[PDB]
From a paper:
Here, we present a crystal structure of the 3-PG-activating [name] from Mycetohabitans sp. B3 and define amino acids governing substrate specificity.
The overall structure was similar to the known homologs with the core of the single-domain protein being a six-stranded mixed β-sheet. Each building block of [name] (i.e., guanine, ribose, phosphate, and glycerate) is bound by several interactions. Guanine is distinguished from adenine by two H-bond donors to its oxygen (main-chain nitrogen of V65 and P86) and two H-bond acceptors to its amino group (main-chain carbonyl group of E89 and G90). The α- and β-phosphates are bound by two Mg2+ ions, which in turn are positioned by three aspartates (D116, D193, D191) similarly as had been shown for FbiD before. Hence, [name] is tightly bound, in fact, it turned out to be still quantitatively bound after purification of the protein from E. coli cell lysate, where both substrates were present. The 3-PG moiety is primarily bound by H-bonds with the side chain of S165 to the carboxy group, apparently a highly conserved binding site of the carboxylate of the C3-acid as known from Mtb-FbiD. The reason why the 3-PG adopts a new orientation is the main-chain rotation of S162, the CA and CB of which then squeeze the 3-PG into the productive conformation.
Residue numbers in the entry: 12 to 214
Amino acid sequence: GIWAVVPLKAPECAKTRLAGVLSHAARQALFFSMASHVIGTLRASPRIASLLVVTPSESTAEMARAAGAEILWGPPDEGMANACSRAMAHIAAAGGERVMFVPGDLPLLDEAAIDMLSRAPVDAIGMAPNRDGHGTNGLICRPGAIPLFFSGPSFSAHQNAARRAGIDVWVVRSREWALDVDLPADLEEFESSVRDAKRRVLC
Ligand SMILES: Nc1nc2c(ncn2[C@@H]2O[C@H](COP(=O)(O)OP(=O)(O)OC[C@@H](O)C(=O)O)[C@@H](O)[C@H]2O)c(=O)[nH]1
Ligand SMILES: [Cl-]
Ligand SMILES: [Mg+2]
Ligand SMILES: [Mg+2]
């Protein structure tokens, strides 16, 4: 009985840390591409009972419904932590057993990745770090086990929240969880695994 929660911005103010290397339109294109991939991946997962997108944008909300998500309104520019917290409280009020927070910028995410994080015991915090190992690209818990600390040194914050509460932690590290696209270096790493995949799978 896992609810998946994908927080998503307005497309006109998405991936601001790529504004040096992509145009306004190139950032919208990458934002939508990655988000319907994340949403579509969770939607096809036999492990995801329900799928909620949190967004302030009619544009984002229509794309998300079309990909099969239910929609929760959030105000703009509150950050991932408060958008996920809003959803967690709605899901908790509504009887939700477990919730998995997944950002919309994981272009390599697969069924294998969802399955592994969903195999954390119900009474633990499941936690998937980013490539530099300071951030959090997935967390699954009982609604209300810890408060949320997404963005910045989030991995540290989550681990410390679990320690304080004496709650077990299951860390899941993989190529597919770790690469979120925020920075130019991140986009190039994405581009580079997509060329590897032409060669390995095709030629
Ligand atoms: N509804 C709502 N959605 C938002 C908002 N702010 C951003 N998001 C979404 O939260 C997700 C991650 O934003 P991003 O800039 O990639 O965060 P990042 O630095 O990688 O760190 C987050 C997490 O991965 C971590 O490492 O702790 C994306 O799907 C954003 O669109 C917002 O105020 N409202
Ligand atoms: Cl974004
Ligand atoms: Mg990110
Ligand atoms: Mg990140």
